[PDB]
Design a protein around this ligand. Structure first.
Ligand SMILES: O=C(O)[C@H]1O[C@@H](O[C@H]2[C@H](O)[C@H](O)[C@H](O)O[C@@H]2C(=O)O)[C@@H](O)[C@@H](O)[C@@H]1O
Lengths: 266, 266
């Protein structure tokens, strides 16, 4: 069971900080019990009410006012999940997630890892499926924004890992596709270098989905403008926090800013 | 297996009739061996060349110049399949199949049937899938235009059977959905009455797919204008001929007209 405690006032409660209040009301918390079963997940603030929701892994640092996410162990996660399952294909509906993030001591996080991946995912666009119930879910996110230890000798960069078709390539429903060209790592994904991650400094990310486009700005500069016509049928949603693709360590992300905005016109 | 012959000149060869040449060049023939096993199907004119393709089940009546499709037995078929796998969701791309059809003595065709369906399908909009290879095919056609013996005491009408979502509701990939509300017959399909089939007279059908609409005109009159936004990701295609959903008899359709036209602009 995941617990809540502000450690006698040491930890700030996220719902008490105006800069995070709106995104919190628009979301729920999906967090693993670090010492529970593999890949486990608990849900809180199902209604968007984060009042009282705080613990050692999810809090606001009272001095910096950063929203802090932590999690230990491979495949465990700690994320705010924005509730809207939005269409990505319409010209008059644009959905934006804006963040300023610093990943804390990621090389140390990964010291004892033997993962071949060695990534921390801190922003994501997932699909729900064809409908709000998750029918025909595709078990691949549209986007993962990650800190990656070593990508063919390029060390400590941020990357956007973009799923570049709508094909199921793993699991029970991917058996017919997994060995085809469309499921090869270099075909099913397009990767964008978002730059070397800086030390002791936050980096701004702005992700806009809509009008058949996935747009990513980094520190105010447009780096990704990717056509996602192929994803048109999939209702999609934002997550932010940490998700571990490395073993035997704890990740830690500090968000100086986390915002969500829907721009629906006409 | 399927053999070709004009019966010493008695049968007209479809490729020799100018009014059918264009649709044929744009299609292939998918036809069953009438004596073979349920569901069997053979393929001819893979390149659109129908020269020499004629037999007692697929011919032009030399007197009337009707293109004749016949087939006997349950779940056997005899259809031209138009090659283009088109998008249905774009405003500047519309795809039209136009036919004038007469179903010959269908009550006699079904005289010995024990099928609960008792339908002859003679026009169809199918999906290929997400791509030309058929990835993630949905095993349900978007549309079937049929002659139906009896639908809730309404006898001998034409119907448009329209699949009203993009959900797989049967087969190995439908197990998770098949018992849900979205797969119930009354939800998964919308049925339109296209009128009582006339005696000894052809009926015109014009099917237009594109711009997120499925339109059906019957003798010029717009009877179906259905929003197909839900099908947007599925590349789709036309078939025309006969497909039997009844047992122990022979279907026969006479097409005075069969045309295909793509209206692609910018
Ligand atoms: O397949 C990928 O692109 C990424 O999948 C991730 O696992 C998914 C998993 O398939 C489920 O959808 C689950 O709900 O979420 C996981 C996720 O991390 O979002 C990871 O395996 C990631 O490395 C893959 O690259």
């Amino acid at each position: 069971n995941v617990q809540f405690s502000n450690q006698d006032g040491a930890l700030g409660e996220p719902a008490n900080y105006t800069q995070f209040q709106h995104v919190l009301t628009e979301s729920e918390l999906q967090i693993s019990d670090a010492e529970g079963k593999k890949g486990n997940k608990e849900y809180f603030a199902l209604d968007g009410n984060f009042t009282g929701i705080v613990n050692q892994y999810f809090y606001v640092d009272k001095k910096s006012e950063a929203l802090v996410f932590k999690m230990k162990n491979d495949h465990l996660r700690n994320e705010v999940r924005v509730h809207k399952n939005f269409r990505t294909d319409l010209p008059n509906k644009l959905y934006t997630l804006s963040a300023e993030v610093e990943i804390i001591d990621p090389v140390a996080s990964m010291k004892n890892s033997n993962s071949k991946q060695n990534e921390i995912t801190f922003l994501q666009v997932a699909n729900k499926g064809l409908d709000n119930q998750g029918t025909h879910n595709v078990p691949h996110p549209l986007l993962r924004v990650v800190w990656k230890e070593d990508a063919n000798s390029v060390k400590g960069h941020f990357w956007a890992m973009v799923k570049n078709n709508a094909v199921i390539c793993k699991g029970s429903f991917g058996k017919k596709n997994k060995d085809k060209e469309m499921c090869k790592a270099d075909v099913a994904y397009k990767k964008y270098d978002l730059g070397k991650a800086p030390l002791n400094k936050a980096t701004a990310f702005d992700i806009t989905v809509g009008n058949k486009q996935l747009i990513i700005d980094v520190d105010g500069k447009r780096l990704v403008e990717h056509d996602i016509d192929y994803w048109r049928h999939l209702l999609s949603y934002f997550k932010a926090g940490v998700a571990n693709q490395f073993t035997n360590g704890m990740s830690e992300a500090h968000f100086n800013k986390l915002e969500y905005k829907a721009l629906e016109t006409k």
